């Protein structure tokens, strides 16, 4: 080895790694970024479960994040930062199945709680390698170890023939529990306490967050999660086996091709081909639905996310779950007539009831009718800023907010310690527009600490803000309480519970509690709503 | 023998009585017949005008109530009391009373006519809180009340037969009305200003005179006080109707002619005793014998009328009452009463919805139990009451109410909305209960301005602004005064707007949205959900 820094050289299991110094605000932090920790999973092992990485030779370099996995990438709006914060930063490739490490520099004396990144994009995109993901400032300013691995999204994450050998589903889900074990695994080697492992991710990496909970398997992996913006329950996080098994036909019928010859032939064709054809494979019009998501395929999810967390015990979990103030409003401009980021999508009562529908795919005429006289103001039923702003609401409470409500509510109920919060501050930095009020994956940025990057802009209070925020996480990986054990002055963070439904606002303001997260129209949507679909 | 009290009416002379109202005299001409008594083979058909008497009348004191069911449920409270009959049942009771200022109006004064409420099935225009003596002192108003047939006798109806057409309370209300255009001048009433009000069944009344042609050459303003003539109780189809009319036959002891016929043979009271026995689940605020859509004195639905009407040249002046539904707990829906608090258990609450909303589906019961859960406090017994009595006030008044409002204003009408907060300092039910339907009654009709009566001051105050509300609205079409400013003003009830006044102790307050929100569920969900069941 000779030169190097010997605080950059780590084993692992599969072998030698050598990290980079990175500079955080703060100061140094080890970053060992694209360690392998499944092998490639191409050629014959696209489909395929993780197979863990077969041990190397000599010093691995893992200085540079790794490809992201081959996904769909956004081009909405080509060269918009709000769009392209969000696209993969690295090669697209199928091999693509590393994982990044952050750490204190010097690496921590003693185990240090382990936070683990799983990155949202709605199991189509994402990569753990994405600006917003930097685990430098949790690593710098919390001393946390933070591992963020790539999963495979899309078709080669979540395609699934259920039943099958050769496209079991899920393995998108399993690259991520193969991230785990490897934490479980070598993660000490970075003065990791694999003891003390959070999950958290948002949105699709919350929803993975959550399965993960929701999965023995994955069980002893973890101790605690964070889930933002997302839930393993809830219409879009998962696909019944049916369901799966129709996309995946009709996803091999679009790309020309008995279960094994059927995945044969995917695997004989291109990754690009199958990203381009992924999108194709959706049953409705919609937005918030993506083609090749968890399949509650018996065996991951041993039953729907529903069902397991209606009756699963949590005894042992600390759960962190929150949203953004305006979950929705993300997603109106991907397929909402209407909508824009380049203006104020001020809408029509026709563009809502058409929004509606293409919001609540599933939703028969009946249900849409009510989504759309409980999301009516009828004092102004035509005004077009309440139109547009329930059309956020609507969609942001069908596929976040009230699933994120129901998941709170269950969890407490069968026994979980569970904070549930709004995050409600608009980074001043946003480039979305101020119709979207702070969309969801916008509070990312500030739990990972970007605002203590002073080249980034962001003003002093969010700096201060995200020091709060890193502050809830780390406390909440460290405890399962994301409050400061130390500063009592503070206003205390209280868990949620079916009784009183406590949940916290973060914003700039000091954390203001508030109790029923949207509690009459998640009553709609998780009590009612699946009633009026039973007729 | 005071020549004020003397008036020729068409079918002959009326001696009246001097009544003494706090400001001064008022002549009372009380019990006047406006039609036949509808006895004998004349129970359960139309009135007919009261044939011209010899000498003097005596219009001296009520007559007698219509045959109605007496409520016993809670025997001497005065809250049950002062709704019962306080005069001999009688199936001849086919009369109205008129108060006029004293000495009688130089000129014609606006006219109004009161129709009581009672569900269908009782009232009397001679309750004390009909009262039209301070109407007539304080405003000069000529203040008219009919009796009217209730129960079987106004509205059991074989709907097609010529000897149970239905709707003959209504007609006996429509003959008042008439008899008010004949002879209201005599009294120095204006037939050419005659504003109906009515509060809840007699609002609902109100509301069919607005819907039945006949009915609106009799009227030029209509105030519908916490009920209208659309909504789940006012009325019954034709064959509802048939249903409960051959229903209550059976049950008595009886082809039309004949049955009715039979059912004519029966004493008042079996019918009466049979009454309550025909509907067709365990209801509250649901009644037997209430208007039939007839297609002749209500053409189409009332639904349908006010969807379709031109309402031009009317003026309407609609409102409810904060808590439109408690009073209807009490008397059925188990888990409340008048006298503990009325804590229900959410349980109470799911069972109370299916009697509240008896024509509820499973389904619907279920999205009015999840609408007015507050899921923040879902089992609190506090919030269970008020949303069931919330449930049964907005499914019943309040919602029926925004709907007439909105499709009367659609439709050209001249509309007045208010709610009714000030719970009467002397109201005998329980607090829980807050201001229940008919408690604005006595303060529309003056009765704190009887310091006998022991209204606070505040309420004298304002039983004059709600008088001046209600005869300024008999005058002109609008509830304002002509004469005050800034105060503020009552604007119009419009579909945009949506504006209406809380009449309580503080000033008018502008509000938009008589329930918005939950009417809409009511109004437009609630339909498809059923419609669809
Ligand atoms: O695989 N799908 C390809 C495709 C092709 C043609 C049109 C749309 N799609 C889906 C992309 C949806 C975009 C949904 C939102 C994108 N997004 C990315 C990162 C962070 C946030 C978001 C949006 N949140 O609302
Ligand atoms: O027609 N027979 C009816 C009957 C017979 C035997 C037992 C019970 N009932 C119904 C009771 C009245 C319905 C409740 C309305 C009571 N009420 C009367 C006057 C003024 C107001 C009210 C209550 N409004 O909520």
């Not at 979540?158 to 393995?171: C, I, K, M, T």
């Not at 996309?247 to 990203?275: F, H, K, M, S």
Request: with cysteine.
């Amino acid at each position: 080895e000779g030169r190097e820094d010997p605080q950059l050289l780590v084993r692992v299991r599969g072998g030698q790694l050598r990290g980079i110094r990175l500079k955080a605000p703060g100061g140094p932090v080890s970053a060992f970024l694209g360690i392998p920790f499944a092998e490639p999973p191409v050629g014959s092992r696209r489909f395929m479960p993780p197979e863990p990485k077969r041990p190397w030779s000599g010093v691995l370099d893992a200085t540079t994040f790794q490809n992201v996995c081959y996904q769909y990438v956004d081009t909405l709006y080509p060269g918009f930062e709000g769009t392209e914060m969000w696209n993969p930063n690295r090669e697209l490739s199928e091999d693509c199945l590393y994982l990044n490490v952050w750490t204190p520099y010097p690496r921590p004396a003693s185990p240090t709680p382990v936070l683990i990144w799983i990155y949202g994009g709605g199991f189509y995109s994402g990569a753990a390698s994405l600006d917003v993901y930097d685990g430098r400032f949790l690593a710098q300013v919390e001393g946390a170890v933070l591992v963020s691995m790539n999963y495979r999204v899309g078709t080669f994450g979540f395609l699934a023939l259920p039943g099958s050998r050769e496209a079991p589903g899920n393995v998108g889900l399993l690259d991520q529990r193969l991230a785990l074990q490897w934490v479980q695994e070598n993660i000490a080697a970075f003065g990791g306490d694999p003891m003390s492992v959070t999950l958290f991710g948002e949105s699709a990496g919350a929803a993975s967050v959550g399965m993960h909970i929701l999965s023995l398997p994955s069980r002893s992996l973890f101790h605690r999660a964070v889930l933002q913006s997302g839930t393993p329950n809830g219409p879009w996080a998962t696909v019944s086996a049916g369901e799966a098994r129709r996309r995946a036909t009709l996803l091999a019928r679009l790309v020309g091709c008995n279960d094994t010859e059927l995945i044969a032939c995917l695997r004989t064709r291109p990754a690009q081909d199958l990203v381009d054809h992924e999108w194709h494979v959706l049953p409705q019009e919609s937005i918030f639905r993506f083609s090749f998501v968890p399949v509650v395929d018996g065996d991951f999810l041993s039953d729907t996310p529903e069902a397991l967390i209606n009756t699963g015990d949590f005894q042992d979990l600390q759960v962190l779950v929150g949203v953004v103030k305006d979950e929705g409003s993300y997603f109106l401009v991907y397929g909402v007539p209407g909508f824009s980021k380049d203006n104020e999508s001020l809408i029509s009562r026709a563009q809502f009831l058409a929004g509606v529908r293409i919001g609540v795919p599933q939703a028969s005429d009946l249900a849409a009718e009510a989504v759309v006289l409980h999301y009516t103001d009828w004092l102004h039923p035509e005004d077009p800023t309440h139109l547009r702003d329930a059309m956020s609401a609507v969609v942001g409470d069908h596929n976040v907010v009230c699933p994120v409500a129901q998941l709170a509510g269950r969890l407490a109920a069968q026994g979980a310690r569970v904070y549930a919060y709004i995050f409600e501050h608009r980074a001043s930095t946003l480039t979305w527009p101020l119709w979207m009020g702070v969309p969801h994956g916008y509070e990312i940025e500030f739990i990972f600490g970007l605002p203590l990057d002073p080249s980034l802009n962001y003003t002093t209070e969010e700096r201060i803000f995200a020091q709060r925020l890193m502050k809830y996480w780390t406390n909440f990986a460290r405890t399962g309480d994301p409050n400061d054990p130390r500063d009592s002055k503070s206003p205390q963070w209280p868990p949620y519970t079916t009784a009183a439904q406590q949940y916290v606002s973060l914003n700039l303001k000091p954390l203001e509690v508030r109790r029923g997260l949207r509690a009459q129209t998640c009553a709609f949507w998780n009590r009612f709503l699946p009633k009026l679909l039973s007729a």
